[PDB]
Design an enzyme around this catalytic site. Structure first.
Site, PDB file in Angstrom:
ATOM      1  N   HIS A  41       0.803  -1.219   0.000  1.00  0.00           N
ATOM      2  CA  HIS A  41       0.000   0.000   0.000  1.00  0.00           C
ATOM      3  C   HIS A  41       0.844   1.281   0.000  1.00  0.00           C
ATOM      4  O   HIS A  41       0.266   2.353  -0.146  1.00  0.00           O
ATOM      5  CB  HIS A  41      -1.075   0.016   1.106  1.00  0.00           C
ATOM      6  CG  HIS A  41      -0.599   0.103   2.535  1.00  0.00           C
ATOM      7  ND1 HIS A  41       0.052   1.227   3.021  1.00  0.00           N
ATOM      8  CD2 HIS A  41      -0.845  -0.733   3.570  1.00  0.00           C
ATOM      9  CE1 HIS A  41       0.209   1.023   4.321  1.00  0.00           C
ATOM     10  NE2 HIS A  41      -0.297  -0.153   4.694  1.00  0.00           N
ATOM     11  N   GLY A 143       2.362   6.259  10.126  1.00  0.00           N
ATOM     12  CA  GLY A 143       3.785   6.153   9.825  1.00  0.00           C
ATOM     13  C   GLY A 143       4.411   4.852  10.312  1.00  0.00           C
ATOM     14  O   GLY A 143       5.564   4.560   9.992  1.00  0.00           O
ATOM     15  N   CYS A 145       3.425   1.780   9.517  1.00  0.00           N
ATOM     16  CA  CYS A 145       3.329   0.653   8.590  1.00  0.00           C
ATOM     17  C   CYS A 145       4.692   0.156   8.159  1.00  0.00           C
ATOM     18  O   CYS A 145       5.641   0.937   8.038  1.00  0.00           O
ATOM     19  CB  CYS A 145       2.431   0.973   7.411  1.00  0.00           C
ATOM     20  SG  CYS A 145       0.735   1.350   7.896  1.00  0.00           S
TER      21      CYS A 145
HETATM   22  C1  LIG Z   1      -2.353   2.839   4.992  1.00  0.00           C
HETATM   23  O1  LIG Z   1      -3.232   3.518   5.900  1.00  0.00           O
HETATM   24  C2  LIG Z   1      -4.332   2.782   6.450  1.00  0.00           C
HETATM   25  C3  LIG Z   1      -3.946   2.357   7.895  1.00  0.00           C
HETATM   26  O2  LIG Z   1      -4.663   1.580   8.508  1.00  0.00           O
HETATM   27  N1  LIG Z   1      -2.857   2.955   8.423  1.00  0.00           N
HETATM   28  C4  LIG Z   1      -2.450   2.907   9.776  1.00  0.00           C
HETATM   29  C5  LIG Z   1      -1.825   1.809  10.368  1.00  0.00           C
HETATM   30  N2  LIG Z   1      -1.552   1.686  11.674  1.00  0.00           N
HETATM   31  C6  LIG Z   1      -1.893   2.694  12.470  1.00  0.00           C
HETATM   32  C7  LIG Z   1      -2.517   3.884  12.021  1.00  0.00           C
HETATM   33  C8  LIG Z   1      -2.879   4.945  12.890  1.00  0.00           C
HETATM   34  C9  LIG Z   1      -3.473   6.073  12.396  1.00  0.00           C
HETATM   35  C10 LIG Z   1      -3.722   6.207  11.036  1.00  0.00           C
HETATM   36  C11 LIG Z   1      -3.399   5.204  10.167  1.00  0.00           C
HETATM   37  C12 LIG Z   1      -2.795   4.004  10.630  1.00  0.00           C
HETATM   38  C13 LIG Z   1      -5.398   3.857   6.711  1.00  0.00           C
HETATM   39  C14 LIG Z   1      -6.224   4.097   5.467  1.00  0.00           C
HETATM   40  O3  LIG Z   1      -6.890   2.899   5.020  1.00  0.00           O
HETATM   41  C15 LIG Z   1      -6.166   1.731   5.070  1.00  0.00           C
HETATM   42  C16 LIG Z   1      -6.789   0.623   4.516  1.00  0.00           C
HETATM   43  C17 LIG Z   1      -6.111  -0.580   4.461  1.00  0.00           C
HETATM   44  C18 LIG Z   1      -4.821  -0.650   4.944  1.00  0.00           C
HETATM   45 CL1  LIG Z   1      -3.902  -2.107   4.700  1.00  0.00          CL
HETATM   46  C19 LIG Z   1      -4.203   0.435   5.536  1.00  0.00           C
HETATM   47  C20 LIG Z   1      -4.870   1.657   5.594  1.00  0.00           C
END
Ligand SMILES: CO[C@@]1(C(=O)Nc2cncc3ccccc23)CCOc2ccc(Cl)cc21
Ligand SMILES: CO[C@@]1(C(=O)Nc2cncc3ccccc23)CCOc2ccc(Cl)cc21
EC number: 3.4.19.12
Lengths: 305, 300
Positions: A41, A143, A145
């Site tokens: 992603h 951040g 991920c």
């Molecule tokens: C890539 O971002 C997403 C995410 O979950 N990220 C995050 C992961 N961890 C903590 C988070 C804390 C606060 C904000 C986002 C967080 C959000 C948008 O939709 C999605 C949809 C699917 C996936 Cl696989 C990721 C995502």
């Protein structure tokens, strides 16, 4: 003496964390040998996330669209490919700090250490369990991920988790290092939810053995139970079924403390039906389920890496 | 989202852990630049421990009586000196893995990560707080002496604790890296006991602010309190007094959540009176006191 929620020493993994930038998005990558692994992603805009065609989004990227930074050194990406939900960026330099490693897929109930990272820099380390509903109760901000989960077995790092998503209840979802999600999750911004979770029974029993080893015995009783009667009670209280494999795995702890596994099950049954009565076990008013039988033995025996 | 008891990544400290042997005793040492720091009790036999005269025991040792092993490499000891309860062994090789570091003495309530070690090899990492009674509730077996506690705010490792002893209640006592014990403890096997422990009030308040930041508000109430009335109540539950310094330190969390410090104190008073009524706060059925205000801001 003492019993803490303990993570594996993170040094071997710290030397693998890198920053991966694709356009406006920056997240973490795991640099092992000449490959940097990260969530696929990283190539998506917020709009792409609504319904991504990763093969189509990726074909539009070139190697120079991926900026990989290892400390204060920019690595050059010389290839890119996808394996399930992980992007693999081939780089021109093998990581000199690559430890002995393996990729392992864990089962629910298994614990691992998470090295939370931001901008390719490790921020903290904590221990957690893969819940029976395939989520982890992690602590991850935007951040994070690409942060990874691992165990160490002798001198070998077994990478078991890569962070991808946070669900609406604040719990987390990710993949193994082959990019396969734990749980029925997808890497798309669409309605998803953690399913109803249950307590990891074998781990609660392991933690009760840890409490006994540390001098906490108030919950012990003269009773025993059958495995089937115990499982009727476990089902009632949303506890996972205890199998004969779990009973066998608890054998060493049972022999050390002198409390048979089914004798400890009768203590757990009484705790489920009556509560703790204002008391605590190892400083907890809840039954702790994020220590496996192996974690208990390792902590009570002082295994090093 | 989420709130976990989080330790600092231990890599910077792992590269400093060595094994120190003196006669029959083996424990851990911290190798920084050309010096290995370890508990001075490494020179004692089990008999020497009741009334050791460390100056007299040390004067009888030569450099070759100290065996220092870093991985599978024996380091050569070229000097030895004692600073308070720590022994400093000068070695002929500077640790190439020495991070940017400092020695800091912490106050009760402060948290730190412990890298538990055995035979100079790291076993695990966990988070601790220096209790008001100057002990730490660690996880240490025999052979863990010399394991260290640290913080790593901004690439610099601040070493704050070196493990020396386990008290009869299973809690732990140690020194700063200048060898000064935390608390009224001494490195001798004479009868010693942890004083009555109390709850770190400012940390419980910080953790309640963490719960509000993470979306939980069930424990909030329409009341406020004076600082003195809060302290009169809190003391009855074995909570440490909350000072004006603690109120000031909670200012940023108060401004972020919109809950005045004395309003959060009123929630804490109510929690102490009522318990949780089957509810949890950040996955806990007890009030957590091992997160400082600084830890909460760092994590949330
Ligand atoms: C890539 O971002 C997403 C995410 O979950 N990220 C995050 C992961 N961890 C903590 C988070 C804390 C606060 C904000 C986002 C967080 C959000 C948008 O939709 C999605 C949809 C699917 C996936 Cl696989 C990721 C995502
Ligand atoms: C030198 O070792 C002692 C010790 O506490 N060691 C330990 C420290 N940690 C965990 C321990 C777990 C189990 C067994 C011992 C532990 C024991 C003898 O009396 C004393 C007296 C003073 C001092 Cl400064 C140390 C000691």
């Amino acid at each position: 003496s003492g019993f803490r929620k303990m993570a594996f020493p993170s040094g071997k993994v710290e030397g693998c964390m890198v920053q991966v930038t694709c356009g406006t998005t920056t997240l973490n990558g795991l640099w092992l040998d000449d490959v940097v692994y990260c969530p696929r992603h990283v190539i998506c805009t917020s709009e792409d996330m609504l319904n991504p065609n990763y093969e189509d989004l990726l074909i539009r990227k070139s190697n120079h669209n991926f900026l990989v930074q290892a400390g204060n050194v920019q690595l050059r990406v010389i290839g890119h490919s996808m394996q399930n939900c992980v992007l693999k960026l081939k780089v021109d330099t093998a990581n000199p700090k690559t430890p002995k490693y393996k990729f392992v897929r864990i089962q629910p109930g298994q614990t691992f250490s998470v090295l939370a990272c931001y901008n390719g820099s490790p921020s903290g380390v904590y221990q957690c369990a893969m819940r029976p509903n395939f989520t982890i109760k992690g602590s991850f901000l935007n951040g994070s991920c690409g942060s990874v989960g691992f165990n160490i077995d002798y001198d070998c790092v077994s990478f078991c988790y890569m962070h991808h998503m946070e669900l609406p209840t604040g719990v987390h979802a990710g993949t193994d290092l082959e990019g396969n999600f734990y749980g029925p999750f997808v890497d798309r911004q669409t309605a998803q939810a953690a399913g109803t979770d249950t307590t990891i029974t074998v781990n609660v029993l392991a933690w009760l053995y840890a409490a006994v080893i540390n001098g906490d015995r108030w919950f012990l009783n003269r009773f025993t139970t059958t495995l089937n009667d115990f499982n009727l009670v476990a089902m009632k209280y949303n506890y996972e079924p205890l199998t004969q494999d779990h009973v066998d795995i608890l054998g060493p702890l049972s022999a050390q403390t002198g409390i048979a596994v089914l004798d400890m099950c009768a203590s757990l049954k009484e705790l489920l039906q009556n509560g703790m009565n204002g008391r605590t076990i190892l400083g907890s008013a809840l039954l702790e389920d994020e220590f496996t039988p192996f974690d208990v033995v390792r902590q009570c025996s002082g295994v090093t890496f």
